[PDB]
């Protein structure tokens, strides 16, 4: 319901319904976790804040999304971890110059994920070798 009517929301309307929303990380029932990443990942696509200044809102559920979206490197379930390293991997949310890539990894450490990030982070830089005429 939540990912039906979520495009037609105020950003106020949506922080007050992200809350309950992100809480679900710890939920079991993959499916349910599944949706929720999905819709994360409608409100990060659309949540960049292209223009200049937000609202406190718009700004903030970018801000409490993005968190969310981090932690879901470190999810205790392939295919699904599998999902959001390919968002996060994907042109437009991590950059394809390595270099940009290089400086971006940084743009989600998240302190709760450090024990993973180096691991993530190689895999971020060299899931890029895998597009060149070298091989």
Known sequence: ?????????????????????????????TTCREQMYNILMWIHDNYRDPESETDNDSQEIFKLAKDVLIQGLI?????LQLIIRNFWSHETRLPSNTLDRLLALNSLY??????HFLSLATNFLLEMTSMSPDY
């Open 1 to 29: 319901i939540i990912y039906k009517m979520m495009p037609k929301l105020k950003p106020v309307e949506l922080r007050e319904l992200l809350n309950p929303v992100v809480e679900f990380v710890s939920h079991p029932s």
């Open 75 to 79: 999810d205790e379930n392939p295919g």
């Open 110 to 115: 998240s302190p709760k994920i450090e024990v």
